[PDB]
Structure 1
Amino acid sequence: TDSIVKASNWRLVEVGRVVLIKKGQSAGKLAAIVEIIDQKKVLIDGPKAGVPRQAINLGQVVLTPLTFALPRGARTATVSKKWAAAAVCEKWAASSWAKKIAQRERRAALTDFERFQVMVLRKQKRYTVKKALAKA
Protein backbone atom coordinates (compact mmCIF):
# COMPACT_ATOMS: atom_id res chain seq x y z
CA THR A 1 0.00 0.00 0.00
CA ASP A 2 3.12 2.18 0.21
CA SER A 3 5.42 3.40 -2.54
CA ILE A 4 8.62 1.41 -3.13
CA VAL A 5 11.62 3.10 -4.76
CA LYS A 6 14.99 1.37 -5.01
CA ALA A 7 17.61 3.51 -3.27
CA SER A 8 20.91 2.69 -5.03
CA ASN A 9 22.98 4.35 -2.31
CA TRP A 10 26.24 5.59 -3.82
CA ARG A 11 29.38 6.54 -1.97
CA LEU A 12 29.36 10.34 -1.91
CA VAL A 13 32.16 12.82 -2.52
CA GLU A 14 31.90 14.79 0.71
CA VAL A 15 34.01 16.29 3.47
CA GLY A 16 35.04 13.46 5.76
CA ARG A 17 34.68 10.74 3.12
CA VAL A 18 37.46 8.17 3.45
CA VAL A 19 39.25 7.33 0.20
CA LEU A 20 41.87 4.74 -0.73
CA ILE A 21 44.66 6.03 -2.97
CA LYS A 22 45.46 3.46 -5.65
CA LYS A 23 48.34 5.08 -7.57
CA GLY A 24 51.03 7.60 -6.69
CA GLN A 25 53.42 8.00 -3.79
CA SER A 26 50.69 6.72 -1.45
CA ALA A 27 49.41 3.83 -3.60
CA GLY A 28 47.32 1.97 -1.02
CA LYS A 29 46.93 4.41 1.89
CA LEU A 30 43.79 5.97 3.34
CA ALA A 31 43.03 9.68 3.17
CA ALA A 32 40.10 11.91 4.06
CA ILE A 33 38.33 14.32 1.73
CA VAL A 34 39.04 17.72 3.26
CA GLU A 35 37.16 19.75 0.66
CA ILE A 36 35.77 19.51 -2.88
CA ILE A 37 37.49 21.63 -5.53
CA ASP A 38 35.68 20.51 -8.69
CA GLN A 39 33.61 17.61 -10.02
CA LYS A 40 36.89 15.78 -10.66
CA LYS A 41 39.16 17.27 -7.96
CA VAL A 42 39.24 17.17 -4.17
CA LEU A 43 41.63 18.31 -1.46
CA ILE A 44 42.45 15.28 0.70
CA ASP A 45 44.54 14.66 3.82
CA GLY A 46 45.86 11.32 5.05
CA PRO A 47 48.03 12.32 8.02
CA LYS A 48 47.72 9.02 9.91
CA ALA A 49 48.95 6.99 6.92
CA GLY A 50 51.48 9.67 5.97
CA VAL A 51 49.56 10.97 2.94
CA PRO A 52 50.44 14.67 2.50
CA ARG A 53 47.71 17.26 2.27
CA GLN A 54 47.15 17.62 -1.45
CA ALA A 55 44.72 18.41 -4.22
CA ILE A 56 44.14 15.11 -6.03
CA ASN A 57 42.11 14.00 -9.03
CA LEU A 58 39.22 11.75 -8.02
CA GLY A 59 40.46 9.29 -10.65
CA GLN A 60 43.53 8.66 -8.47
CA VAL A 61 41.44 7.47 -5.49
CA VAL A 62 38.57 5.07 -4.85
CA LEU A 63 35.85 6.09 -2.42
CA THR A 64 35.46 3.83 0.59
CA PRO A 65 32.15 3.33 2.43
CA LEU A 66 33.68 4.99 5.52
CA THR A 67 32.74 8.52 6.59
CA PHE A 68 33.47 10.50 9.73
CA ALA A 69 32.56 13.93 11.08
CA LEU A 70 35.01 16.49 9.73
CA PRO A 71 34.47 20.21 9.06
CA ARG A 72 35.08 21.55 5.58
CA GLY A 73 38.63 22.81 5.10
CA ALA A 74 39.99 21.30 8.32
CA ARG A 75 43.78 21.50 8.58
CA THR A 76 46.09 18.52 9.08
CA ALA A 77 46.02 18.59 12.89
CA THR A 78 42.21 18.69 12.95
CA VAL A 79 41.97 15.91 10.35
CA SER A 80 44.33 13.76 12.43
CA LYS A 81 42.38 14.46 15.62
CA LYS A 82 39.00 13.60 14.12
CA TRP A 83 40.44 10.55 12.33
CA ALA A 84 41.85 9.17 15.58
CA ALA A 85 38.60 9.99 17.39
CA ALA A 86 36.48 8.19 14.78
CA ALA A 87 38.92 5.22 14.66
CA VAL A 88 38.81 5.11 10.86
CA CYS A 89 41.81 2.77 10.63
CA GLU A 90 40.11 0.10 12.75
CA LYS A 91 36.84 0.43 10.84
CA TRP A 92 38.71 -0.10 7.57
CA ALA A 93 40.78 -2.98 8.96
CA ALA A 94 37.54 -4.70 9.95
CA SER A 95 36.20 -4.47 6.38
CA SER A 96 36.47 -7.37 3.95
CA TRP A 97 38.09 -4.96 1.47
CA ALA A 98 41.15 -4.31 3.63
CA LYS A 99 41.16 -7.96 4.69
CA LYS A 100 41.29 -8.95 1.01
CA ILE A 101 44.16 -6.50 0.43
CA ALA A 102 46.05 -7.95 3.40
CA GLN A 103 45.39 -11.47 2.13
CA ARG A 104 46.83 -10.60 -1.27
CA GLU A 105 49.88 -9.04 0.40
CA ARG A 106 50.41 -12.12 2.59
CA ARG A 107 50.08 -14.48 -0.38
CA ALA A 108 52.56 -12.36 -2.34
CA ALA A 109 54.93 -12.51 0.65
CA LEU A 110 54.72 -16.31 1.01
CA THR A 111 57.96 -18.24 0.47
CA ASP A 112 58.31 -21.53 -1.43
CA PHE A 113 58.36 -23.54 1.81
CA GLU A 114 55.27 -21.67 3.00
CA ARG A 115 53.55 -22.45 -0.32
CA PHE A 116 54.37 -26.14 0.20
CA GLN A 117 52.89 -25.92 3.70
CA VAL A 118 49.83 -24.19 2.22
CA MET A 119 49.36 -27.07 -0.21
CA VAL A 120 49.71 -29.65 2.58
CA LEU A 121 47.22 -27.85 4.82
CA ARG A 122 44.85 -27.35 1.89
CA LYS A 123 44.96 -31.10 1.24
CA GLN A 124 44.15 -31.79 4.90
CA LYS A 125 41.28 -29.29 4.96
CA ARG A 126 40.05 -30.64 1.62
CA TYR A 127 40.00 -34.17 3.03
CA THR A 128 37.94 -33.04 6.02
CA VAL A 129 35.58 -30.90 3.92
CA LYS A 130 34.99 -33.60 1.30
CA LYS A 131 34.24 -36.08 4.07
CA ALA A 132 31.73 -33.65 5.59
CA LEU A 133 30.14 -32.97 2.19
CA ALA A 134 29.71 -36.69 1.57
CA LYS A 135 28.25 -37.22 5.04
CA ALA A 136 25.80 -34.37 4.40
Structure 2
Amino acid sequence: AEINVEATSWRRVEVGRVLKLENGSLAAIVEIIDHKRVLADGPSSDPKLATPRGIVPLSRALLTPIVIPKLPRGARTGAVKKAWEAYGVDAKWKETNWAKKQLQQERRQSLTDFDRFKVMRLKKQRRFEERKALAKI
Protein backbone atom coordinates (compact mmCIF):
# COMPACT_ATOMS: atom_id res chain seq x y z
CA ALA A 1 0.00 0.00 0.00
CA GLU A 2 1.58 3.24 -1.24
CA ILE A 3 -0.04 6.57 -0.33
CA ASN A 4 1.27 10.01 -1.31
CA VAL A 5 -0.68 12.97 0.09
CA GLU A 6 0.32 16.65 0.11
CA ALA A 7 -2.79 18.63 1.04
CA THR A 8 -2.18 20.99 3.99
CA SER A 9 -0.20 21.57 7.17
CA TRP A 10 -1.93 24.03 9.49
CA ARG A 11 -1.01 25.25 12.95
CA ARG A 12 -3.50 24.15 15.61
CA VAL A 13 -4.68 26.01 18.69
CA GLU A 14 -4.17 24.05 21.90
CA VAL A 15 -2.91 24.59 25.43
CA GLY A 16 0.75 25.55 25.42
CA ARG A 17 1.00 27.22 22.00
CA VAL A 18 2.29 30.79 22.02
CA LEU A 19 0.70 33.27 19.63
CA LYS A 20 1.50 36.79 18.48
CA LEU A 21 -0.65 39.89 19.00
CA GLU A 22 -0.77 43.06 16.89
CA ASN A 23 0.85 45.03 19.69
CA GLY A 24 3.74 42.77 18.71
CA SER A 25 3.40 40.70 21.88
CA LEU A 26 3.37 37.00 22.71
CA ALA A 27 0.90 35.04 24.81
CA ALA A 28 0.54 31.31 25.50
CA ILE A 29 -2.87 29.65 25.40
CA VAL A 30 -4.01 28.42 28.82
CA GLU A 31 -7.64 27.48 28.11
CA ILE A 32 -9.64 27.31 24.89
CA ILE A 33 -12.92 29.13 25.48
CA ASP A 34 -14.75 28.82 22.16
CA HIS A 35 -13.85 27.97 18.57
CA LYS A 36 -12.84 31.60 17.99
CA ARG A 37 -11.68 32.94 21.38
CA VAL A 38 -8.99 31.70 23.76
CA LEU A 39 -7.57 32.62 27.16
CA ALA A 40 -3.91 33.61 26.99
CA ASP A 41 -1.11 34.78 29.27
CA GLY A 42 2.28 36.36 28.66
CA PRO A 43 4.61 36.15 31.65
CA SER A 44 7.67 37.06 29.57
CA SER A 45 10.22 39.23 31.37
CA ASP A 46 10.72 41.34 28.24
CA PRO A 47 8.38 44.36 28.52
CA LYS A 48 7.82 44.31 24.76
CA LEU A 49 6.71 40.65 24.85
CA ALA A 50 4.66 40.83 28.06
CA THR A 51 0.92 40.22 27.81
CA PRO A 52 -1.57 40.38 30.71
CA ARG A 53 -3.58 37.26 31.41
CA GLY A 54 -6.91 37.60 29.65
CA ILE A 55 -9.17 36.71 26.77
CA VAL A 56 -7.85 37.17 23.24
CA PRO A 57 -9.74 36.56 19.98
CA LEU A 58 -8.19 34.30 17.38
CA SER A 59 -9.07 36.92 14.76
CA ARG A 60 -6.63 39.33 16.41
CA ALA A 61 -4.26 36.47 17.28
CA LEU A 62 -1.55 35.03 15.05
CA LEU A 63 -0.17 31.53 15.51
CA THR A 64 3.58 31.15 16.10
CA PRO A 65 5.41 27.82 15.62
CA ILE A 66 6.44 27.53 19.31
CA VAL A 67 4.51 25.12 21.55
CA ILE A 68 5.21 24.56 25.24
CA PRO A 69 5.46 20.75 25.44
CA LYS A 70 3.27 19.85 28.43
CA LEU A 71 1.72 23.09 29.67
CA PRO A 72 -1.27 22.04 31.81
CA ARG A 73 -4.75 23.19 30.92
CA GLY A 74 -5.83 26.05 33.14
CA ALA A 75 -2.27 26.87 34.27
CA ARG A 76 -2.19 30.03 36.47
CA THR A 77 0.41 32.82 35.89
CA GLY A 78 3.21 31.46 38.11
CA ALA A 79 3.25 28.01 36.47
CA VAL A 80 2.98 29.24 32.90
CA LYS A 81 5.97 31.45 33.76
CA LYS A 82 7.87 28.43 35.08
CA ALA A 83 7.22 26.66 31.78
CA TRP A 84 8.14 29.85 29.88
CA GLU A 85 11.64 30.03 31.33
CA ALA A 86 11.97 26.23 31.26
CA TYR A 87 11.36 26.19 27.50
CA GLY A 88 13.11 29.46 26.68
CA VAL A 89 10.31 30.98 24.62
CA ASP A 90 12.10 34.31 24.17
CA ALA A 91 15.17 32.80 22.50
CA LYS A 92 13.11 30.75 20.05
CA TRP A 93 10.88 33.73 19.23
CA LYS A 94 14.02 35.74 18.49
CA GLU A 95 15.27 32.90 16.29
CA THR A 96 11.97 32.80 14.39
CA ASN A 97 11.72 34.76 11.15
CA TRP A 98 8.69 36.84 12.15
CA ALA A 99 10.57 38.58 14.97
CA LYS A 100 13.53 39.14 12.65
CA LYS A 101 11.27 40.93 10.17
CA GLN A 102 9.70 42.93 13.01
CA LEU A 103 13.14 44.04 14.20
CA GLN A 104 14.18 44.99 10.66
CA GLN A 105 10.98 47.03 10.33
CA GLU A 106 11.59 48.70 13.69
CA ARG A 107 15.14 49.65 12.72
CA ARG A 108 14.02 51.02 9.35
CA GLN A 109 11.24 53.06 10.98
CA SER A 110 13.47 54.46 13.76
CA LEU A 111 16.15 55.24 11.17
CA THR A 112 16.54 59.08 10.93
CA ASP A 113 17.42 61.42 8.02
CA PHE A 114 21.25 61.50 8.16
CA ASP A 115 20.92 57.73 8.59
CA ARG A 116 18.71 57.58 5.44
CA PHE A 117 21.57 59.24 3.44
CA LYS A 118 24.11 56.91 5.05
CA VAL A 119 22.05 53.87 4.05
CA MET A 120 21.71 55.24 0.52
CA ARG A 121 25.48 55.75 0.26
CA LEU A 122 26.45 52.38 1.74
CA LYS A 123 23.92 50.51 -0.42
CA LYS A 124 25.45 52.31 -3.39
CA GLN A 125 28.88 50.95 -2.43
CA ARG A 126 27.50 47.44 -1.94
CA ARG A 127 25.62 47.83 -5.24
CA PHE A 128 28.85 48.66 -7.05
CA GLU A 129 30.47 45.54 -5.62
CA GLU A 130 27.42 43.44 -6.55
CA ARG A 131 27.40 44.75 -10.12
CA LYS A 132 31.10 43.96 -10.47
CA ALA A 133 30.35 40.43 -9.25
CA LEU A 134 27.36 40.06 -11.59
CA ALA A 135 29.24 41.30 -14.66
CA LYS A 136 31.57 38.28 -14.52
CA ILE A 137 28.61 35.90 -14.60
Find out whether 1:35 has 2:36 as its counterpart.
no
Question: Comparing 83-92 with 1-10, which one deviates more in the overlay?
Answer: 1-10
Partner of 1:104: 105
CA distance in 2, matches of 1:40, 1:30: 18
Match of 2:88 in 1: 87
**What's the counterpart of residue 131 of structure 1?**
132
- Unmatched 5+ stretches in structure 1: none
Instruction: Note the 1:1-136 alignment, pairs <5 A.
Output: 2-22=2-22, 27-48=23-44, 49-69=49-69, 70-136=71-137
The 3-state SS of whatever aligns with 1:60 is: coil
Take 2:95 and 2:84, find their aligned partners in 1: how far apart are those partners?
16
**Partner letter of residue 12 of structure 1?**
R
Q: Deviations over 1:100-128 (max 9, x none)?
A: 00000000000101111100100000000
Instruction: Kindly report the root-mean-square deviation, in angstroms, between the aligned alpha carbons of the 2 structures.
Output: 1.1
Cα deviation digits, residues 51-79 of structure 1 (max 9, x gap) = 11101111121111111121111010111
Structure 1 runs of 4+ off > 4 angstroms?
none
Q: CA deviation at 1:50?
A: 2.5
Deviations 1:3-37 (A, max 9, x none): 10115111111001110011xxxx11111011100
Three-state SS of the structure 2 residue aligned to 1:74 is coil
SS in 2 for 1:108: helix
Q: In structure 1, what is the Cα distance between the partners aligned to 2:38 and 2:13?
A: 9
State how far apart, in whole Å, the 2-side matches of 1:102 and 1:17 are. Answer: 22
Q: Aligned partner of 1:132: which letter?
A: A
Q: Match of 1:115, SS? A: helix
TM-score (norm 2): 0.92
Identity of aligned residues (%): 54
